[PDB]
Design a protein around this ligand. Sequence first.
Ligand code: CA
Ligand code: CA
Ligand code: CA
Lengths: 144, 144, 144
Amino acid sequence: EELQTELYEIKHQILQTMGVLSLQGSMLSVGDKVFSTNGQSVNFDTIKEMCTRAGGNIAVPRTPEENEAIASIAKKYNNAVYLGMIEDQTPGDFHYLDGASVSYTNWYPGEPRGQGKEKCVEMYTDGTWNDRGCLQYRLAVCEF
Amino acid sequence: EELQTELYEIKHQILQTMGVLSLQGSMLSVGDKVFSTNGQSVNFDTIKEMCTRAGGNIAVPRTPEENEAIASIAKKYNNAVYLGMIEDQTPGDFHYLDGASVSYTNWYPGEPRGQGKEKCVEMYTDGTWNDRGCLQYRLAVCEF
Amino acid sequence: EELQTELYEIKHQILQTMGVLSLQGSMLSVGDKVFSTNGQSVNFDTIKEMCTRAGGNIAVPRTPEENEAIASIAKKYNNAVYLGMIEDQTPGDFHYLDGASVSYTNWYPGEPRGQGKEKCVEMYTDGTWNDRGCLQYRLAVCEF
Ligand SMILES: [Ca+2]
Ligand SMILES: [Ca+2]
Ligand SMILES: [Ca+2]
């Protein structure tokens, strides 16, 4: 049947485009998630908008492998990265932007300790996390 | 059935690739149209060939939103853009390259006024149009 | 039926992404093969890994048209390119990395003449081939 070989060509072409983007370092693929940056360092609200404009979301690692991918991008551009999570009303508790409680974490030892005054989360270039105010300039990393 | 979740993965991956290209400013998507440039400034015939070689066509805006997208690219590269239209045998009348009469227009006030000696159309960096000879160096913008 | 117009949109979007990558010189498409480089010059083993990490393979031309595409990339970056082939146990005989005997060739006159001491193959910037040791720094070109 012509349908499946049409699917074959389509799948092949998608893999070619993703292959080119990967080879050139334009993105990193981890499982079903693709991470990318525009190289800009801006505040949390600005990153959120940049990602959504491109049809994605501000990146958030939910597994060690995802964490290491974002860390490698932070390291490449030598700047910390704002992540897609924010502090609950209760200090020390963080949620994803959809409202769910954060599960996987990788806090730098002692963090989070902003006492409710640091509602955002940055990833240091070693991949560990720190709660931080949301107005700093951080590398914009999106997930798709 | 395995067919639709296969379609789901395919759709997701296409959105990832488009998301990366968009985030990095490699293209602009407006409805079903994608605009992109190679950053080169060359004449009308040269642009036509560059676009067709890449499987697209020299850009032409048919809506205000498309017009503003091309204008933003003109503004980014600080150069006017040749558009995909050319003057009819009768001065003042323009057609798309497929032969159809141009519908949406955004002429700079007083334009077109080349009296038949300016068969091409350039978009100024403010998005308005001017009829112009076809031999100038203009930013190559393609639509796909 | 909704399936085929869904396929239409998918095909269109793939062509847009490939069009953007092509227009910007990020890849070259020849038939069903896509060639791309990361611009790096490294040894044979390093190229192999870079290509496989991106989901492709070190490039190998099997037709004159494929050969000319890789040559154009060699010429663009002004460096010779390691190809996806290696010498058999018997000097002068080369195979693709899957083990099959090489068919199409484009040896520089007199080549291969490494007497079994040059197990890799480089493409000179004019597109002709030379057997060479595998430890030189050559442009990494992948096929997808
Ligand atoms: Ca803190
Ligand atoms: Ca004029
Ligand atoms: Ca030799």
